[PDB]
Amino acid sequence: HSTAIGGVWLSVIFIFRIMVLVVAAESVWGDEKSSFICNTLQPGCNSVCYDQFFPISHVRLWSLQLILVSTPALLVAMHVAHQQHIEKKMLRRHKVHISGTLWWTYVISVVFRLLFEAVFMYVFYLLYPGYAMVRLVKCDVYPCPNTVDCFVSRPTEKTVFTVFMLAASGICIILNVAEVVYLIIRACARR
Amino acid sequence: HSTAIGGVWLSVIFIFRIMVLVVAAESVWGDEKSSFICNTLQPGCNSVCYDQFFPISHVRLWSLQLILVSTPALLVAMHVAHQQHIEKKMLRRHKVHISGTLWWTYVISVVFRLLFEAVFMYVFYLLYPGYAMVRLVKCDVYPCPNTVDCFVSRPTEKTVFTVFMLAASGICIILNVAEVVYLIIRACARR
Amino acid sequence: HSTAIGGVWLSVIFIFRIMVLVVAAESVWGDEKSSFICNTLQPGCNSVCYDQFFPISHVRLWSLQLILVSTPALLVAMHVAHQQHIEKKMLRRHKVHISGTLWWTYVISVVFRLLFEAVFMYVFYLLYPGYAMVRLVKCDVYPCPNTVDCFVSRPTEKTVFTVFMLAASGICIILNVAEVVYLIIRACARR
Amino acid sequence: HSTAIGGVWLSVIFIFRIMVLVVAAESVWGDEKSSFICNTLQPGCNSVCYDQFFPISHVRLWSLQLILVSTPALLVAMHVAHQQHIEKKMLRRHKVHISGTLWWTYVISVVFRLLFEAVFMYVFYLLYPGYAMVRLVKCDVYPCPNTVDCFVSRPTEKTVFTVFMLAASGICIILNVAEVVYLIIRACARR
Amino acid sequence: HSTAIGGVWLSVIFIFRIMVLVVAAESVWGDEKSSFICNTLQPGCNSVCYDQFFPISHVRLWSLQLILVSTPALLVAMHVAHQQHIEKKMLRRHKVHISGTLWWTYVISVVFRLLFEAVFMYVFYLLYPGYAMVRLVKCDVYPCPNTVDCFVSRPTEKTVFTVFMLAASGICIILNVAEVVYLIIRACARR
Amino acid sequence: HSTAIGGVWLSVIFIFRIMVLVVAAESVWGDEKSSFICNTLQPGCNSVCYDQFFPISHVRLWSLQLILVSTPALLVAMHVAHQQHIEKKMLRRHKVHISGTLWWTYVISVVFRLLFEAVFMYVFYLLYPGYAMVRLVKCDVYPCPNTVDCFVSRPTEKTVFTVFMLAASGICIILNVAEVVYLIIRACARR
């Protein structure tokens, strides 16, 4: 069974996040490294400064988050497909038990999706505290001499897309919590 | 139900906007940053000047507008698909109530699409007042010394595509308003 | 209904134009701006000279022309699909009236396609009078000092593809006129 | 009807030519202009020399030849599809006449394909007499001073692919001639 | 027959590995060679240093591992499809023998997949002992004079993706071992 | 009819070769020319040296070999499809004759595939005797003065992929020979 409160909004928002990531990664974040430049004559300063200030790109983090969020759905879909194959073999009490075992698996999958979203949000907070990208950064990593100034490619557009993605992720978290609560309420109402 | 006055023209114009954006983004706006050049020896001036004068690219704004306009249609489609799944479960008074609840949802979706289009048009006006791109821009953002001249890649072609997109968006707004009015008239004629 | 004189040749020639544009845009016109070079030390001269001599690329104009020519077909197809949906609703005098109203819509769509093709041909004539691209151009746009010489990337190949596209467009115009005349003759023969 | 002598071999060889062109154009001919270099300090010499020695690229000529060869097949397919639509309308003496009119159209399409292949082969001979690309070319086109030496990107690989394409085209011409002769023989044997 | 313990988790984890590799190879490892730079004026030092420190790219090794792991599944699928074709020919004792022969083939395919995964993990350990990429490397390969410092493009992101892939591969190995043990237990329980 | 000994292994190994070539060509061999560099100030030395040492790229040779190996299968498939069309026309002694004529065609196709594979292997041996790519090459082709040193992009990775492809091709040759022998044995056993 499915609930219109949680499933439809989750699917549409997840599709929206996919479309936003597809738009952003190809064009906005494409030249994140090539356009990265520092005011220095020291060879190798640009690469080490980019690695220091961008350990992992925003689009890569978003793609990993989307994949990890998607994995429970793939797992439950494959499991139900195998169960229906077993049912088709049987055709060529127990069914109630199968449906019962299916129920908790879906609940656990929803909980795991919520946990994955929260973990990725916390990782994003740890790696990039400020939601807004800055135009100039100060670099002191070896072999850059003293401190040099480096310039990010597209701070404002990246900030806008970051705000969009963060708002979508937060709405997803809230909707997952609400869906879990509504599932609990429905289970209580059954009894 | 559907109305030939609003639905068909909306769909064809939305497809036309998709095709125009696909044509424009790949070629016209591809070198918007790489070809951006300023008359200065100061490192980092090009990137900061591009960020100042182009906080978000036109094609990215158009893609976001198209996605946001599309989201209500995806929501209503998913909701009706879930409702038909519930109907198929029932098969294996109330229907009139379901259709009634469906009606206002579609009306609200149309209103939300109109609001999204208007909001994106206003955002475009705020960010880029002039409809026509200019060949030369004056830059005074740090660390550019005093004021430097910078040159846009394809001002005229970008202006032409901007005019096309703006005309399409305005026609979409007018058609949405007309469709809402015609829906009100039809509802009144029913009673 | 359809006529073999106009519909089949129109469709095959339109597909041929699509294939030719796909071949040309990817390779021939890809480096139209990057390979554009002027004999000067003035920064920004290349971009302003390219914008002056190429306000809009040939491939972009051809793509816009193809899209605008295609839009009436999409409109009529969506409208007939909606009408067949209404017919299926009816199944679950008037039909002759529906077919009659369908007839003039198709005629007007053909006329609009012819007008669009003629308008795009006239625009091409206005923007690029000479059918053949030239190897060297003279530039005096600010900030280029005095007059400088600039060199086009692939004049001869672009000329060949321009001749192909122009011949196809002219044949399309002639075939549209002939189809309109034959439709008039058939309508007269009916009475 | 179809003949195994001509149709199957023609289709498989045409598919082989498509695959060979797809392999060649993406990689072999991709850097034909960017890697083109001349031993001179004169700006604009590279572009004019490339245009002089390569008026149209080999891959573009092959693609145009394939498209033009394909067009008669598309025309006859669309025409027979329209005729079958007319037959389906009739269902909801004359048929023998329709088949007879179909026969000469297919024969003329085959003749046109043969003529197109021969014309493209002659054009290739006129533009590039030598089948083998040369490593060094001598350039005297304005504004190149006196005569300069220019270097082609991949002479040997381009020569190999040119030999492959030319052999395929010649085999296609021979097979088309043989198919026409066999059609004449079969028509005579019918009487 | 299939087991839910091994098959579903294996398939979902293999799909997850495909998605992770698709995300990583296009963007993270794209500029692995172009961005590779060494602090020297000696021509050819960059290429030889990259070849010495990166004999084969991580993404290429992962793709080869995925292909080799996939090959047994393709082999068994093609073999069962041929067997079902033979069964369909028969339709137009022995079946038990066919199923028995099928069983050991699937077991051997699982064992081969486990061996391939272990071999690729050992190869990865041999080529890249440290799981984490380093920012700076020391090069002494001819013709680089003495020892030069070279800088890797994206050490931290590559390290993160390497950890992800290694964890997925190890989980796959453990799951394959568990599936083999469970198959042995089920075979014993049958007797 | 089909044989499980030859057909299934041939198909799976051919698919494996396709996947390996797809992995290799896009990334490994992409910068084979752009990254090619020689220690000289002579313009044009890089291009002529690359042409001398790499007359045709490894990936292009592998793609041509795969296409040529595939062509007999396409020919026999098209021929049997035409024969089944003739059979369907007949439906709307002789069949045994058709099957007999089909048999030798498939045998000849297998022999031609084996010959093509052997010929391409011999061509690879002639063009590149050493299986392993070398880091440094010595160039004396005009206009390079005296002898210069040039550096290959990715010698080790290219060597690994070359070994993979050569092993696959040799296994294909052996399997083709074995399939021919088994076909002869089966034909003898029939009598």
mmCIF file of N, CA and C in Angstrom, chain B residues 1-4 7-9 11-12 15-16 19-20 23-24 27-28 31 35 37-40 135-136 138 149 151-158 160-161 164, chain C residues 30 32-34 42-45 47-48 50-52 54-61 63-64 67-68 70-71 74-75 78-79 82 86 89 120 141-143:
data_model
loop_
_atom_site.group_PDB
_atom_site.id
_atom_site.type_symbol
_atom_site.label_atom_id
_atom_site.label_comp_id
_atom_site.label_asym_id
_atom_site.label_seq_id
_atom_site.Cartn_x
_atom_site.Cartn_y
_atom_site.Cartn_z
ATOM 1 N N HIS B 1 -11.100 16.278 -17.030
ATOM 2 C CA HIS B 1 -11.434 16.934 -18.288
ATOM 3 C C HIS B 1 -10.369 17.954 -18.677
ATOM 4 N N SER B 2 -10.356 18.333 -19.951
ATOM 5 C CA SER B 2 -9.399 19.291 -20.479
ATOM 6 C C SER B 2 -10.108 20.292 -21.383
ATOM 7 N N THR B 3 -9.501 21.469 -21.516
ATOM 8 C CA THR B 3 -10.014 22.534 -22.367
ATOM 9 C C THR B 3 -9.038 22.769 -23.510
ATOM 10 N N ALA B 4 -9.561 22.800 -24.738
ATOM 11 C CA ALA B 4 -8.702 22.985 -25.903
ATOM 12 C C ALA B 4 -8.130 24.396 -25.954
ATOM 13 N N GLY B 7 -5.140 24.081 -22.662
ATOM 14 C CA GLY B 7 -4.210 22.973 -22.496
ATOM 15 C C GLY B 7 -3.301 22.760 -23.693
ATOM 16 N N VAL B 8 -3.878 22.744 -24.897
ATOM 17 C CA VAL B 8 -3.098 22.431 -26.094
ATOM 18 C C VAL B 8 -2.067 23.521 -26.363
ATOM 19 N N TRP B 9 -2.493 24.785 -26.310
ATOM 20 C CA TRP B 9 -1.567 25.884 -26.552
ATOM 21 C C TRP B 9 -0.488 25.939 -25.477
ATOM 22 N N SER B 11 0.719 23.371 -23.749
ATOM 23 C CA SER B 11 1.654 22.274 -23.972
ATOM 24 C C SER B 11 2.576 22.559 -25.150
ATOM 25 N N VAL B 12 2.022 23.054 -26.260
ATOM 26 C CA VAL B 12 2.861 23.289 -27.432
ATOM 27 C C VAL B 12 3.852 24.420 -27.173
ATOM 28 N N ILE B 15 6.622 23.082 -24.930
ATOM 29 C CA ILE B 15 7.552 22.283 -25.727
ATOM 30 C C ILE B 15 8.448 23.185 -26.570
ATOM 31 N N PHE B 16 7.873 24.242 -27.148
ATOM 32 C CA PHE B 16 8.662 25.192 -27.925
ATOM 33 C C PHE B 16 9.730 25.851 -27.064
ATOM 34 N N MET B 19 12.549 23.382 -26.551
ATOM 35 C CA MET B 19 13.410 23.278 -27.728
ATOM 36 C C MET B 19 14.312 24.501 -27.865
ATOM 37 N N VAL B 20 13.757 25.691 -27.630
ATOM 38 C CA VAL B 20 14.549 26.914 -27.728
ATOM 39 C C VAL B 20 15.661 26.914 -26.687
ATOM 40 N N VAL B 23 18.400 24.517 -27.747
ATOM 41 C CA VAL B 23 19.226 25.113 -28.796
ATOM 42 C C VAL B 23 20.175 26.150 -28.205
ATOM 43 N N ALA B 24 19.669 26.985 -27.294
ATOM 44 C CA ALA B 24 20.447 28.124 -26.815
ATOM 45 C C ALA B 24 21.555 27.698 -25.857
ATOM 46 N N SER B 27 25.053 25.903 -27.217
ATOM 47 C CA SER B 27 25.967 26.627 -28.096
ATOM 48 C C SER B 27 26.112 28.098 -27.721
ATOM 49 N N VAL B 28 24.994 28.806 -27.545
ATOM 50 C CA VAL B 28 25.054 30.254 -27.355
ATOM 51 C C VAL B 28 25.700 30.601 -26.019
ATOM 52 N N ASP B 31 30.176 29.258 -23.940
ATOM 53 C CA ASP B 31 31.416 29.978 -23.674
ATOM 54 C C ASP B 31 31.190 31.311 -22.969
ATOM 55 N N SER B 35 34.992 32.813 -22.663
ATOM 56 C CA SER B 35 35.235 33.918 -23.583
ATOM 57 C C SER B 35 35.165 35.278 -22.902
ATOM 58 N N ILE B 37 36.366 38.304 -21.044
ATOM 59 C CA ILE B 37 37.713 38.854 -20.941
ATOM 60 C C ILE B 37 37.622 40.315 -20.523
ATOM 61 N N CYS B 38 38.571 40.747 -19.696
ATOM 62 C CA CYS B 38 38.660 42.125 -19.235
ATOM 63 C C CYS B 38 40.032 42.687 -19.582
ATOM 64 N N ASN B 39 40.085 43.996 -19.834
ATOM 65 C CA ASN B 39 41.327 44.672 -20.207
ATOM 66 C C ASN B 39 42.083 45.036 -18.931
ATOM 67 N N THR B 40 42.800 44.052 -18.394
ATOM 68 C CA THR B 40 43.565 44.250 -17.171
ATOM 69 C C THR B 40 44.593 43.136 -17.037
ATOM 70 N N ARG B 135 27.629 45.122 -25.145
ATOM 71 C CA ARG B 135 28.914 44.593 -25.590
ATOM 72 C C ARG B 135 30.003 44.813 -24.545
ATOM 73 N N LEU B 136 29.999 45.972 -23.889
ATOM 74 C CA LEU B 136 31.045 46.348 -22.947
ATOM 75 C C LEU B 136 30.431 46.671 -21.594
ATOM 76 N N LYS B 138 31.510 47.909 -17.393
ATOM 77 C CA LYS B 138 32.497 48.564 -16.545
ATOM 78 C C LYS B 138 32.530 47.891 -15.179
ATOM 79 N N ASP B 149 37.303 47.575 -18.399
ATOM 80 C CA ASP B 149 36.296 47.223 -19.388
ATOM 81 C C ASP B 149 36.333 45.723 -19.644
ATOM 82 N N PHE B 151 34.189 42.389 -21.791
ATOM 83 C CA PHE B 151 33.472 42.166 -23.041
ATOM 84 C C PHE B 151 32.663 40.878 -22.957
ATOM 85 N N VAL B 152 31.374 40.972 -23.293
ATOM 86 C CA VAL B 152 30.493 39.812 -23.275
ATOM 87 C C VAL B 152 30.681 39.010 -24.556
ATOM 88 N N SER B 153 30.401 37.707 -24.484
ATOM 89 C CA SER B 153 30.716 36.812 -25.594
ATOM 90 C C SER B 153 29.821 37.071 -26.802
ATOM 91 N N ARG B 154 28.510 36.864 -26.652
ATOM 92 C CA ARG B 154 27.574 36.927 -27.779
ATOM 93 C C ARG B 154 26.376 37.782 -27.394
ATOM 94 N N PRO B 155 26.553 39.108 -27.322
ATOM 95 C CA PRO B 155 25.449 39.977 -26.885
ATOM 96 C C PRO B 155 24.198 39.900 -27.753
ATOM 97 N N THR B 156 24.361 39.922 -29.079
ATOM 98 C CA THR B 156 23.202 40.040 -29.965
ATOM 99 C C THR B 156 22.394 38.746 -30.009
ATOM 100 N N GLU B 157 23.074 37.606 -30.145
ATOM 101 C CA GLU B 157 22.375 36.325 -30.165
ATOM 102 C C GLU B 157 21.680 36.062 -28.835
ATOM 103 N N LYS B 158 22.357 36.380 -27.730
ATOM 104 C CA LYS B 158 21.748 36.229 -26.415
ATOM 105 C C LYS B 158 20.537 37.139 -26.272
ATOM 106 N N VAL B 160 18.564 38.108 -28.757
ATOM 107 C CA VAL B 160 17.495 37.535 -29.576
ATOM 108 C C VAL B 160 16.815 36.389 -28.833
ATOM 109 N N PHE B 161 17.616 35.495 -28.247
ATOM 110 C CA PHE B 161 17.037 34.361 -27.532
ATOM 111 C C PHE B 161 16.307 34.816 -26.273
ATOM 112 N N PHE B 164 12.939 36.021 -27.421
ATOM 113 C CA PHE B 164 12.091 34.864 -27.708
ATOM 114 C C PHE B 164 11.529 34.262 -26.424
ATOM 115 N N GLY C 30 31.049 24.575 -34.905
ATOM 116 C CA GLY C 30 31.424 24.460 -33.505
ATOM 117 C C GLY C 30 32.469 25.474 -33.077
ATOM 118 N N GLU C 32 33.211 28.360 -34.492
ATOM 119 C CA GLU C 32 32.986 29.615 -35.202
ATOM 120 C C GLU C 32 33.521 30.811 -34.421
ATOM 121 N N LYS C 33 33.509 30.736 -33.090
ATOM 122 C CA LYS C 33 33.961 31.847 -32.261
ATOM 123 C C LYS C 33 35.383 31.641 -31.750
ATOM 124 N N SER C 34 35.709 30.421 -31.315
ATOM 125 C CA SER C 34 37.038 30.156 -30.773
ATOM 126 C C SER C 34 38.117 30.333 -31.835
ATOM 127 N N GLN C 42 44.652 44.594 -29.471
ATOM 128 C CA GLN C 42 43.648 45.199 -28.609
ATOM 129 C C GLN C 42 42.785 44.116 -27.968
ATOM 130 N N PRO C 43 42.742 44.028 -26.638
ATOM 131 C CA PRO C 43 41.864 43.041 -25.993
ATOM 132 C C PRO C 43 40.399 43.374 -26.236
ATOM 133 N N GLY C 44 39.594 42.334 -26.436
ATOM 134 C CA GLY C 44 38.178 42.495 -26.684
ATOM 135 C C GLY C 44 37.797 42.718 -28.130
ATOM 136 N N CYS C 45 38.771 42.898 -29.026
ATOM 137 C CA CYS C 45 38.456 43.132 -30.432
ATOM 138 C C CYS C 45 37.815 41.906 -31.071
ATOM 139 N N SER C 47 35.902 39.490 -29.796
ATOM 140 C CA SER C 47 34.515 39.251 -29.413
ATOM 141 C C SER C 47 33.576 40.255 -30.072
ATOM 142 N N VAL C 48 33.937 41.540 -30.040
ATOM 143 C CA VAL C 48 33.065 42.560 -30.618
ATOM 144 C C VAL C 48 32.990 42.401 -32.132
ATOM 145 N N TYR C 50 33.322 39.519 -33.830
ATOM 146 C CA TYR C 50 32.459 38.373 -34.090
ATOM 147 C C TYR C 50 30.993 38.738 -33.904
ATOM 148 N N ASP C 51 30.676 39.483 -32.841
ATOM 149 C CA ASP C 51 29.293 39.880 -32.610
ATOM 150 C C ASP C 51 28.781 40.775 -33.733
ATOM 151 N N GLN C 52 29.626 41.686 -34.219
ATOM 152 C CA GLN C 52 29.219 42.577 -35.301
ATOM 153 C C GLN C 52 28.972 41.806 -36.591
ATOM 154 N N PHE C 54 28.623 38.426 -36.981
ATOM 155 C CA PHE C 54 27.739 37.277 -36.795
ATOM 156 C C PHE C 54 26.788 37.571 -35.641
ATOM 157 N N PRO C 55 25.763 38.400 -35.868
ATOM 158 C CA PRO C 55 24.785 38.662 -34.796
ATOM 159 C C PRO C 55 24.108 37.401 -34.286
ATOM 160 N N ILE C 56 23.778 36.478 -35.184
ATOM 161 C CA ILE C 56 23.245 35.170 -34.828
ATOM 162 C C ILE C 56 23.818 34.149 -35.801
ATOM 163 N N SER C 57 24.214 32.993 -35.275
ATOM 164 C CA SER C 57 24.843 31.974 -36.101
ATOM 165 C C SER C 57 23.849 31.394 -37.102
ATOM 166 N N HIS C 58 24.388 30.897 -38.219
ATOM 167 C CA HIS C 58 23.548 30.305 -39.255
ATOM 168 C C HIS C 58 22.795 29.089 -38.729
ATOM 169 N N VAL C 59 23.472 28.245 -37.947
ATOM 170 C CA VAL C 59 22.846 27.022 -37.454
ATOM 171 C C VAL C 59 21.729 27.353 -36.471
ATOM 172 N N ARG C 60 21.924 28.391 -35.654
ATOM 173 C CA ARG C 60 20.871 28.802 -34.731
ATOM 174 C C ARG C 60 19.648 29.313 -35.483
ATOM 175 N N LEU C 61 19.867 30.097 -36.542
ATOM 176 C CA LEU C 61 18.754 30.560 -37.363
ATOM 177 C C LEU C 61 18.022 29.390 -38.007
ATOM 178 N N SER C 63 17.889 26.267 -36.916
ATOM 179 C CA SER C 63 17.174 25.532 -35.879
ATOM 180 C C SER C 63 15.896 26.254 -35.471
ATOM 181 N N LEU C 64 15.965 27.580 -35.317
ATOM 182 C CA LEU C 64 14.766 28.346 -34.991
ATOM 183 C C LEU C 64 13.732 28.241 -36.103
ATOM 184 N N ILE C 67 12.105 24.804 -35.873
ATOM 185 C CA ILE C 67 11.183 24.727 -34.742
ATOM 186 C C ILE C 67 9.885 25.465 -35.059
ATOM 187 N N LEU C 68 9.997 26.681 -35.602
ATOM 188 C CA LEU C 68 8.805 27.466 -35.912
ATOM 189 C C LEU C 68 7.965 26.798 -36.994
ATOM 190 N N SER C 70 7.819 23.604 -37.396
ATOM 191 C CA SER C 70 7.252 22.399 -36.802
ATOM 192 C C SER C 70 6.067 22.714 -35.895
ATOM 193 N N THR C 71 6.056 23.901 -35.270
ATOM 194 C CA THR C 71 5.014 24.199 -34.281
ATOM 195 C C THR C 71 3.574 24.045 -34.789
ATOM 196 N N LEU C 74 2.636 20.371 -34.568
ATOM 197 C CA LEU C 74 2.403 19.956 -33.189
ATOM 198 C C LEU C 74 1.054 20.455 -32.691
ATOM 199 N N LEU C 75 0.710 21.703 -33.022
ATOM 200 C CA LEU C 75 -0.575 22.256 -32.603
ATOM 201 C C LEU C 75 -1.739 21.455 -33.173
ATOM 202 N N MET C 78 -1.923 17.921 -31.550
ATOM 203 C CA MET C 78 -2.478 17.956 -30.202
ATOM 204 C C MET C 78 -3.979 18.213 -30.245
ATOM 205 N N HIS C 79 -4.412 19.089 -31.154
ATOM 206 C CA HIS C 79 -5.833 19.400 -31.246
ATOM 207 C C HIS C 79 -6.639 18.194 -31.719
ATOM 208 N N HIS C 82 -6.882 15.711 -28.866
ATOM 209 C CA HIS C 82 -7.923 16.112 -27.925
ATOM 210 C C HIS C 82 -9.310 15.820 -28.489
ATOM 211 N N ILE C 86 -12.268 13.439 -27.006
ATOM 212 C CA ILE C 86 -13.674 13.816 -26.856
ATOM 213 C C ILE C 86 -14.578 12.795 -27.539
ATOM 214 N N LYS C 89 -14.833 9.820 -25.359
ATOM 215 C CA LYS C 89 -15.769 10.116 -24.278
ATOM 216 C C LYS C 89 -17.211 10.003 -24.759
ATOM 217 N N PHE C 120 11.672 33.594 -42.479
ATOM 218 C CA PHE C 120 13.031 33.218 -42.103
ATOM 219 C C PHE C 120 13.993 33.383 -43.274
ATOM 220 N N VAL C 141 34.733 48.327 -35.180
ATOM 221 C CA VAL C 141 33.897 48.504 -34.000
ATOM 222 C C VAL C 141 34.776 48.780 -32.789
ATOM 223 N N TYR C 142 34.316 49.672 -31.916
ATOM 224 C CA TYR C 142 35.030 49.956 -30.680
ATOM 225 C C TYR C 142 35.156 48.679 -29.853
ATOM 226 N N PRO C 143 36.301 48.439 -29.191
ATOM 227 C CA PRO C 143 37.475 49.311 -29.105
ATOM 228 C C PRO C 143 38.585 48.992 -30.104
#
